[PDB]
Design a protein around this ligand. Sequence first.
Ligand SMILES: C[C@@H](O)CC[C@@H](C)O
Lengths: 135, 139
Amino acid sequence: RPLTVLQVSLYHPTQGPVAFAHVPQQLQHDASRLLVGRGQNTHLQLQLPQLSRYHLSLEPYLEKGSSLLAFCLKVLTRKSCVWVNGLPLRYLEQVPLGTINRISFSGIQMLVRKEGGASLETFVCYFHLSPSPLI
Amino acid sequence: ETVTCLQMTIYHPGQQSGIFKSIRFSSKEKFPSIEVVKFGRNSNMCQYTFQDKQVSRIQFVLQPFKQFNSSVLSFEIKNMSKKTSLMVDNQELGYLNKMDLPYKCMLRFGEYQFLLQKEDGESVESFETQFIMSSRPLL
Ligand SMILES: C[C@@H](O)CC[C@@H](C)O
């Protein structure tokens, strides 16, 4: 596997077509943080008025002794909490991602499945729009 | 509300040649706490740039965050350079290695010496940087 892959599934119970209208099929990202929110300057733009312009970020990094990228999810919104694997995170709090991640925020359900790959400079996300609940 | 300040005293043995010429000294600069502050050679990628071909286009970044059960602003530092290790006191950060910044610490990368001192403030939405000159080496 040349790149770490994040398989991302998204769900919203009532606003899918508008909320996900700008979600691409995939994004290949570098070693900078990946921004998620309703703003135009985000990498994953989700068009929900309850989101902040910058709502959360995914940061790739390396632990000492590791040959595989880790990912740190940090909350950027002041408005609400982001549940990550059972922990309700609030502004500027953060946790690392595991292999399967259940993330909910402002009605959006998001699953992130991480498959490790070799690159330490690049990763790719694939986005699936689920008609049915994920969590 | 008071604002957390990162006071960075910076030194380079060749600084008289203009290494820090784009840095404004002793002037606080305010950033949203959702910003990431980057240091490096490339002015399109970094808020703070050094006039130095030895400096990577992005050398390191400051990542503001909050510990659980804490009301103060912490900062990770992360090395972005593939070629140049970043020393935080005696801890060596390789490429994409990060760590929490102590309240007082010495940063070293190449010939650069930075003394970083964090002064907590009560604002959670903002923080400030401040740069201090040193005519003589810090280390
Ligand atoms: C005792 C517990 O309920 C609160 C502890 C403080 C440190 O947050």
